Amino acid sequence: ANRATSAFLDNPHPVGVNYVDEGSRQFVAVAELLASKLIDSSRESDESNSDVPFVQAYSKFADDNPRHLRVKTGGKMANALTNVIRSYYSINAPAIVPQVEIDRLASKATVSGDMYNSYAIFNSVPIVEVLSPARTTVSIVGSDRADVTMLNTGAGAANITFNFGQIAETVILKGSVPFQLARLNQPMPAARFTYKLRPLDGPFIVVLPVGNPLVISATAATRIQVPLAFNKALVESGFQTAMNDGLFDIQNVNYYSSFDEFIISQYHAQDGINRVSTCVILGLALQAYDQMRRALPV
C-alpha cells in the first residue's frame, strides 16, 4: 500500500497567539477602513485637480501633515500593521507593538472589531490521503484544482481510496474518461463523468481498470466566517506582497502559494478552530497592507 497526500496540507506551523483581543481586532478593522479611504483618495484627487483629498486621508492614517520632500510611509500605523502581521504568521515571531499603541490607533475610526459578521468560500482541495494497492501509481498535483493521475499495471482492477477530510462542504470530481466511484461498503454505480460528494460521507472507492491512465480533477468549496469587509482579491494580493517584503521570513515556518492554501492547511490541523480565528484576522491585516502599500510604495 502507498499513501499520497496534498503538499500544502503537510505540517501546518503554529500561528501566533498575540493581538487577538477585542482591542487588537478593532485596530486591524480601523486600519483596513483607513487604508481603503487612502486608495479612493487618489481618484478623488484627479477629479478635484488638487491634493486635498489625499492630504486629508494621509493625515488621518499617519497622524501627520506630509511634506513634499519626505517619503510618505504611513507613520506609526504602518509600522504597527507590519509588526502585527509578522506576529500572526508564527508563534516564534516577537510581539514588538505595545498594547497602549494599539488602543490609541484603534480610536482613530469608529468601526467594530467583529470578525464573524459574514462568510467566504475558499477553493483549496483538501486531499488528506489516497491509499492505493501495490501495483498502482498515484500522483497528486495542484491546490485550487487537484489532478490525480492513476495508472495500474496489475492484471486485475484496483480499488483506490480517497479521503477529503471533514471540513470541506462540497467536492466535485471530473475524470478524463468515465469512471466508477462509490462510498465505503456501497454498491458501485455505472461509469460517469462527474460526481458530487459530501466529504463527511466517508472514504470513497474508485475502481481503476487496467489500461490507459485515469485522471480525476477535483474542486472543493469551504465556508469560513470572515468580516463583511473581507475581499479575496485584495487578501491574495497582500499575501504575495507580504512574502515579497520578507514579513514571513522566520525560522521553522511553512510557505504557501496563496492565502487559500494557508487557511485551509491550518483548518485541518488538530486545533483547527482556534487557528482559523487567528488566520482570519491576518487576512484582514493583509487586505489593509495591500491597500496601504499600493498607495504608499516604499
Partner: peptide
Amino acid sequence: NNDTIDVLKMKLRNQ
C-alpha cells in the same frame, strides 16, 4: 470653494 461634499463632510467630522 473647490472641496466636494465628501471632503467637506470629513473636515467637519474630524473637528
